[PDB]
Amino acid sequence: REIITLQLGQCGNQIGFEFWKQLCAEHGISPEGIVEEFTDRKDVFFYQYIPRAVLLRVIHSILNSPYAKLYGNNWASGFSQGEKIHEDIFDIIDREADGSDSLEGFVLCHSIAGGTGSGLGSYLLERLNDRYPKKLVQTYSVFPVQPYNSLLTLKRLTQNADCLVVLDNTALNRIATDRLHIQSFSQINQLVSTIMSASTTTLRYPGYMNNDLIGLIASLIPTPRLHFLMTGYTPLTTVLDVMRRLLQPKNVMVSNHCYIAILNIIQGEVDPTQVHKSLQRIRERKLANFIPWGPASIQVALSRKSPYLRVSGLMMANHTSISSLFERTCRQYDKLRKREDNFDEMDTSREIVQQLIDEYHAATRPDYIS
Amino acid sequence: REIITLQLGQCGNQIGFEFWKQLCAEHGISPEGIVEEFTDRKDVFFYQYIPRAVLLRVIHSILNSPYAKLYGNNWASGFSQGEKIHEDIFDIIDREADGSDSLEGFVLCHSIAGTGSGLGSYLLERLNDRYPKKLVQTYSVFPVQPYNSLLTLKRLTQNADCLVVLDNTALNRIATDRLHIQSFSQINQLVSTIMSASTTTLRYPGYMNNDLIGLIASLIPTPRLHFLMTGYTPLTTVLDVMRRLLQPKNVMVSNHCYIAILNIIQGEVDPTQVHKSLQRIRERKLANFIPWGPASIQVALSRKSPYLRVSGLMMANHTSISSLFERTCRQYDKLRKREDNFDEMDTSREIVQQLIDEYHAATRPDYIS
Amino acid sequence: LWHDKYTLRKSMIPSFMTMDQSRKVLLIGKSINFLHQVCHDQTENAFQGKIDAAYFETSKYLLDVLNKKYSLLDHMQAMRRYLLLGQGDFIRHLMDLLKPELVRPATTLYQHNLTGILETAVRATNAQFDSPEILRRLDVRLLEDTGWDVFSLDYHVDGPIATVFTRECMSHYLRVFNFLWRAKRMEYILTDIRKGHMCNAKLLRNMPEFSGVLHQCHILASEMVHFIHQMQYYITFEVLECSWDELWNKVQQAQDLDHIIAAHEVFLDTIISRCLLDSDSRALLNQLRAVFDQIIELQNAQDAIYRAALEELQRRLQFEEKKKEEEEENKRIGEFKESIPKMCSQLRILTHFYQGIVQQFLVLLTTDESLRFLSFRLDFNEHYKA
Amino acid sequence: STGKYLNVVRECGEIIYTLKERAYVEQIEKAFNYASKVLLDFLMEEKELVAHLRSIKRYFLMDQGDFFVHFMDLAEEELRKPVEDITPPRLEALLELALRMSTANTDPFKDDLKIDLMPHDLISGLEAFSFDYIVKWPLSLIINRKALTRYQMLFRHMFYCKHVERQLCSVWISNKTFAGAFTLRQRMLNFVQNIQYYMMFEVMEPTWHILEKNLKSASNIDDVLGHHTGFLDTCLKDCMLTLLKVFSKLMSVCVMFTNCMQKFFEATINKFDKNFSAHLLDLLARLSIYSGMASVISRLDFNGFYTE
Numbered sequence A: 001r002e003i004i005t006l007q008l009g010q011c012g013n014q015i016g017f018e019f020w021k022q023l024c025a026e027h028g029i030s031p032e033g034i035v036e037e038f039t040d041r042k043d044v045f046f047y048q049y050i051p052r053a054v055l056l057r058v059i060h061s062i063l064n065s066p067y068a069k070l071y072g073n074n075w076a077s078g079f080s081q082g083e084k085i086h087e088d089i090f091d092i093i094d095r096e097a098d099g100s101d102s103l104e105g106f107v108l109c110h111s112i113a114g115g116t117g118s119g120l121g122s123y124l125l126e127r128l129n130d131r132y133p134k135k136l137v138q139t140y141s142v143f144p145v146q147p148y149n150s151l152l153t154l155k156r157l158t159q160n161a162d163c164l165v166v167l168d169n170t171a172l173n174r175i176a177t178d179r180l181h182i183q184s185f186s187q188i189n190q191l192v193s194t195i196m197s198a199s200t201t202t203l204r205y206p207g208y209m210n211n212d213l214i215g216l217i218a219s220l221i222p223t224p225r226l227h228f229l230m231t232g233y234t235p236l237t238t239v240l241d242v243m244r245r246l247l248q249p250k251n252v253m254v255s256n257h258c259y260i261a262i263l264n265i266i267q268g269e270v271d272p273t274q275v276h277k278s279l280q281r282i283r284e285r286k287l288a289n290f291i292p293w294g295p296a297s298i299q300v301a302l303s304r305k306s307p308y309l310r311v312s313g314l315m316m317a318n319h320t321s322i323s324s325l326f327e328r329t330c331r332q333y334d335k336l337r338k339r340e341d342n343f344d345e346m347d348t349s350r351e352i353v354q355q356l357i358d359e360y361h362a363a364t365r366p367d368y369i370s
Numbered sequence B: 001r002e003i004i005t006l007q008l009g010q011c012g013n014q015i016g017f018e019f020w021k022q023l024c025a026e027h028g029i030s031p032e033g034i035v036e037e038f039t040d041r042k043d044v045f046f047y048q049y050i051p052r053a054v055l056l057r058v059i060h061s062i063l064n065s066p067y068a069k070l071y072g073n074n075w076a077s078g079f080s081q082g083e084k085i086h087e088d089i090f091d092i093i094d095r096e097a098d099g100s101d102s103l104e105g106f107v108l109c110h111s112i113a114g115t116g117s118g119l120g121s122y123l124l125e126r127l128n129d130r131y132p133k134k135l136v137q138t139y140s141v142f143p144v145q146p147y148n149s150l151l152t153l154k155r156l157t158q159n160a161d162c163l164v165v166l167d168n169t170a171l172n173r174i175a176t177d178r179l180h181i182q183s184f185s186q187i188n189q190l191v192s193t194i195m196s197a198s199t200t201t202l203r204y205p206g207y208m209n210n211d212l213i214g215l216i217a218s219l220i221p222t223p224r225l226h227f228l229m230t231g232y233t234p235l236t237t238v239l240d241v242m243r244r245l246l247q248p249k250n251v252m253v254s255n256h257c258y259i260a261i262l263n264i265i266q267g268e269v270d271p272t273q274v275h276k277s278l279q280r281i282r283e284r285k286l287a288n289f290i291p292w293g294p295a296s297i298q299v300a301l302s303r304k305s306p307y308l309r310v311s312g313l314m315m316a317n318h319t320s321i322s323s324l325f326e327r328t329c330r331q332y333d334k335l336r337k338r339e340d341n342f343d344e345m346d347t348s349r350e351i352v353q354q355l356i357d358e359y360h361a362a363t364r365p366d367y368i369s
Numbered sequence C: 001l002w003h004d005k006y007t008l009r010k011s012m013i014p015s016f017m018t019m020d021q022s023r024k025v026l027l028i029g030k031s032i033n034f035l036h037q038v039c040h041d042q043t044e045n046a047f048q049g050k051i052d053a054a055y056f057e058t059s060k061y062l063l064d065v066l067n068k069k070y071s072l073l074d075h076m077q078a079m080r081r082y083l084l085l086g087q088g089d090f091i092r093h094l095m096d097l098l099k100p101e102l103v104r105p106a107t108t109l110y111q112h113n114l115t116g117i118l119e120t121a122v123r124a125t126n127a128q129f130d131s132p133e134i135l136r137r138l139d140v141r142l143l144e145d146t147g148w149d150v151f152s153l154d155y156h157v158d159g160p161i162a163t164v165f166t167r168e169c170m171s172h173y174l175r176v177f178n179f180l181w182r183a184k185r186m187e188y189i190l191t192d193i194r195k196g197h198m199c200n201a202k203l204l205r206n207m208p209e210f211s212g213v214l215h216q217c218h219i220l221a222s223e224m225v226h227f228i229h230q231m232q233y234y235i236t237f238e239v240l241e242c243s244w245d246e247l248w249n250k251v252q253q254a255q256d257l258d259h260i261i262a263a264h265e266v267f268l269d270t271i272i273s274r275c276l277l278d279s280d281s282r283a284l285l286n287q288l289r290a291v292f293d294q295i296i297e298l299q300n301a302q303d304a305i306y307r308a309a310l311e312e313l314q315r316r317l318q319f320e321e322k323k324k325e326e327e328e329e330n331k332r333i334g335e336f337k338e339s340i341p342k343m344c345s346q347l348r349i350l351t352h353f354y355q356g357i358v359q360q361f362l363v364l365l366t367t368d369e370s371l372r373f374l375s376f377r378l379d380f381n382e383h384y385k386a
Numbered sequence D: 001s002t003g004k005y006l007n008v009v010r011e012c013g014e015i016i017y018t019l020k021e022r023a024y025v026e027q028i029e030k031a032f033n034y035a036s037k038v039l040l041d042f043l044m045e046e047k048e049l050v051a052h053l054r055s056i057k058r059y060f061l062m063d064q065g066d067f068f069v070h071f072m073d074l075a076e077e078e079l080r081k082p083v084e085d086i087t088p089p090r091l092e093a094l095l096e097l098a099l100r101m102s103t104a105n106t107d108p109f110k111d112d113l114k115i116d117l118m119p120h121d122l123i124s125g126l127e128a129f130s131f132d133y134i135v136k137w138p139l140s141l142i143i144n145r146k147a148l149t150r151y152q153m154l155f156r157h158m159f160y161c162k163h164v165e166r167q168l169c170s171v172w173i174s175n176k177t178f179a180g181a182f183t184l185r186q187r188m189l190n191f192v193q194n195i196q197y198y199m200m201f202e203v204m205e206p207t208w209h210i211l212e213k214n215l216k217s218a219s220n221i222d223d224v225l226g227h228h229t230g231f232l233d234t235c236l237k238d239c240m241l242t243l244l245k246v247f248s249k250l251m252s253v254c255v256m257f258t259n260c261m262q263k264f265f266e267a268t269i270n271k272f273d274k275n276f277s278a279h280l281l282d283l284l285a286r287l288s289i290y291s292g293m294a295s296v297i298s299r300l301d302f303n304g305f306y307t308e
């Protein structure tokens, strides 16, 4: 099973290039796409070595980078231009798809804040939902006329993408000023690429469980609507300390309430016998709450750090608080709707995002069913 | 339970900056916020290490100090500008609140003598609105000056669940008597000694007093008589230390009786002659208390930091603190006969008179009713 | 070779040799006889020190040849990756290729066909970069229904290495492999259903009268995948990764090949005990099978409700695209709405019986100690127990 | 006594006859004096007896403060539930999490704390909770089930007094934004926080301080077995644990008064006064009539109050 990734817009292209840099460094692959001498399953993201990427001005910057051997601002303009070159890009996508043995998904890295990447990703998501009906679509979308584009992207993402991971530049900048003392794109992108590389750790280093994307998705997302996740990365030592530092709101990349599903990935050489004690004590001290209707638990898995490159850890959560962010956008849209062919698509977008926020707000009730 | 501290004005910054320096050394923590290798509970004030402080042109003096990797004159100007940034500084406090496990208190360090007076008056009001279950202790420092001083006292008598007085006048004497200075850079060294040794029982866990509400509810009997004064002798048995704390030469204050006394002995003195001294203090009658309610004296031991000899601090609830108010109350009326409603000052004037009457009623055998 | 061919003789042990010392020689001799034939490699108080000196050297060398070339040690590690599903990457691809075959009944199944499939998987996954010797023994065997009831791997071992396994470790591994195979297909079913729903709602999201009953299909899934996706962790961390650690710790320090046999023999008495394959825990496993069955009945009662909605959707597509009569279909559309509450009474009675077999399952765990760590995995956040 | 010491260490990790000369009697002592020095040191440095008794004191005598203020804060809602209603798999998960998050993390022997819900009270839910400690063989000669339940009898008597003034001090903030109850709360708080001080720094502490020194001059195990039970029979004697049941009923009006104030009448606050003050005067009447048990009165009243 092979995962193909797509990079749209300046932000998406930059974060994808840095992610590929990080992943090539994790393995023994020189910038010249030649394996270095110096166990790690690398077939998923690399083709025998060339990455499975589809880039769509900064391309010249990448071509001038040492890694050359490795390959308007409106939403409506982006959508129109994406409709204009449907066949041109889809020939590339189809040749790269059918060239693969068994395709699995379509990772999409783009910024929904604005520009052409937003509308282009909208159009691509629609067309991929049209053509390929059996391919999971995960999206590493990055959160920031901007409210218009953002809400349109949310409208297209709440029904097409079978999963989604949010990344807000505000929280990243906050963490940068707090514990990195920057005052830049090229600095927050480091942490972004770190989180991304650590996200797909269990796919490249095989373990007891989590050998496929469905193993990561179907565990967290219980219903097809609640498919927005948040990330946490504590190392910026026992597993209990890691789990206690992870659940702190100081580290989560997010600006009653309870949890739906939690997943922990530990990349250290820790003793794997103390994890059950860690979970026992976490349940004892009652540091986190769960849904009252269905039985929801926390899952933990281990892995191995890249030997060619200490204890680290990442956390993927399904928290109902994320809806708050949408509200802000929603709010701004209303503020933008009363200040200034049919202009009805934006109204439908507002309607469906209101539906989604209502569903999130109803999810935290003991009678969420019906 | 964590305690997030606040620092307002040039005073609050300087005492807090020197309070942290006394704490950072008392633990094995380098000024680079890195633990040095070189048992002491350090989670209350530090977050795994970063101090839980929310400061508010002296700030630049801290950013140039080696500790950079660890983080007008009208009362109306302080209360006005504080309303203009209501959402700004409350964004920080709120994001620092939920990130903590379970918030316990708000130790606020400010001097009632420019902007720290008007801003602190604004905060102590706004905290009771949103946070109704959080203790708010204040290490206020006593010095148009009569106006800004008493106006803060209106808020400090109904909002702050505790208050520790530290007047610069009595400190300046101890600066002159036993230190012979004639400077702010010296008297604050004594203030930092009082602030650090105040929370020695929270950072070093013992039999009792493992939470801030344990030190508060013991001394303060009623919500109004919530003003405390300090006493620090080392500038040898437990009897040597206990006798020196009760002398008026040591108290940081310029009939009358005590309400509750707590003694902090940071020495390695054997815990067997602790009851003998208390027995002796009762016999010679070195201090008197309230006649109406049962008032007792409490003594607590602790352990000095090995990374840094007997010391001693005393938390006192003395009725003679009413004298400091009268000095403020007196000079106000003189300025009231010398020069949009000017009603807040008169309304504040009334409530301070209610407080002073409550003290002088506390020394009566019929203080009830 | 390990399980058989080398049995201690209780009658001819000299009196001046303690009964424990007699199991360090039978383990040291077997460690060298198995190092030659199967692994295909060739090289008082002072008396007690000689046995331990030959133990802490031969065994420590058996692992090195069993970790670099795949060599008694390099077979133990390689017999965990495949026979105990410790690889994950290889067993994933192997369950996708045997799917079209095992669905047929066993009568049409012949061994000579499956070997080409197994050989294909070892070439595709990461198991290709592996010692050729240990790959020569990895084969298939057919137990004697459906193809998912008679398939299993064998990994036959003969020669000097056969004195460590001794025909009993090969009769216990297959006793374990059945439980790890079932708990692996009961998961790839529940990630297929959870995959269908992500492509289901992308088609029939325009029928607001069907989402009322489609919702009960999602909640029952996310309540069922938890019980399985949690039991997988208890299998990984509290059965495999924990009981194997007490084996690799009593091997790099053991010697005389008789502290290796006794360390590998008890390694198969805890896994049989930590898993529910014991003799006195029979009431527990038969109780678990019922939960394994309810996962299949959902997968049968789902596509019936799933496909019945795609037919009515497909007819509704053609009933309007060719024309853009009206009264003869409203009775067909009208009756279709009337069949919905019938299907709702299925998922309402299937769920109410699924919860009645899990809340009964937990009561049986309170019986023998390591099982308590399972009750916490399932009952996290107290979704059950009121 | 020589070889037995050699066995509780082995499983974990020339003599001639003469008459009128004792060349063997001295030889046995030169080995017994080493047979003990290897075992005693085995218990103080690795798996730290004197370094083993201190760990028990931290939880049983509640010496460690950071562990209880964080444990009762987490396991309070799950203790007010009645008996035979709480799952021990729920408490122990909180106990493990209470130790690691606290400052008791630096304790090699912390993994021997077990929850043990007693059937009888201190002759439910909260009054039926007490730690249990399991020890290995060689140390089980000193600290055994006969002399560990005593550690468990003077523990609940201190977990009760720590619980009341934990919530009595909790109502202190609720009332602080009808006005005659503040002078009654002063009468109970200055009673428990005047019993706890006498119970911690002038009763068990002094006895413990003696035991530590009294174990440096030990000579044989049947003496250490005397300096230990000689320490537990003193703590149970100087405290009110040995009758003086008026304390038990005296505590009821304190905890119940917290419930009345928690229901937010004026004729009930004064009802508690005449009931509690009468119960207190029964105590000092019996505490005074004796032959310390007399210095406790100087701790209860200090201003000459209660001179009636």
Ligand SMILES: Nc1nc2c(ncn2[C@@H]2O[C@H](COP(=O)(O)OP(=O)(O)O)[C@@H](O)[C@H]2O)c(=O)[nH]1
Pocket (backbone or CB within 6 Å): A009, A010, A011, A014, A015, A072, A073, A111, A113, A114, A115, A116, A117, A118, A142, A144, A169, A185, A186, A188, A189
């Ligand atoms: N987090 C992050 N966001 C970025 C970065 N570069 C650009 N962005 C976001 O991308 C948006 C601009 O997109 P733009 O390049 O104009 O899209 P285009 O018009 O299609 O080229 C801004 O709102 C940024 O928030 C980056 O390095 N990191």
Ligand SMILES: Nc1nc2c(ncn2[C@@H]2O[C@H](COP(=O)(O)OP(=O)(O)O)[C@@H](O)[C@H]2O)c(=O)[nH]1
Pocket (backbone or CB within 6 Å): B008, B009, B010, B011, B014, B015, B072, B073, B111, B113, B114, B115, B116, B117, B141, B142, B143, B168, B184, B185, B187, B188, B191
């Ligand atoms: N004890 C002490 N008091 C100080 C120190 N520095 C300033 N103060 C007090 O703070 C008052 C001046 O406050 P100010 O700095 O003008 O407040 P601002 O207007 O907010 O900057 C004076 O009356 C001093 O009594 C110090 O180092 N130690």
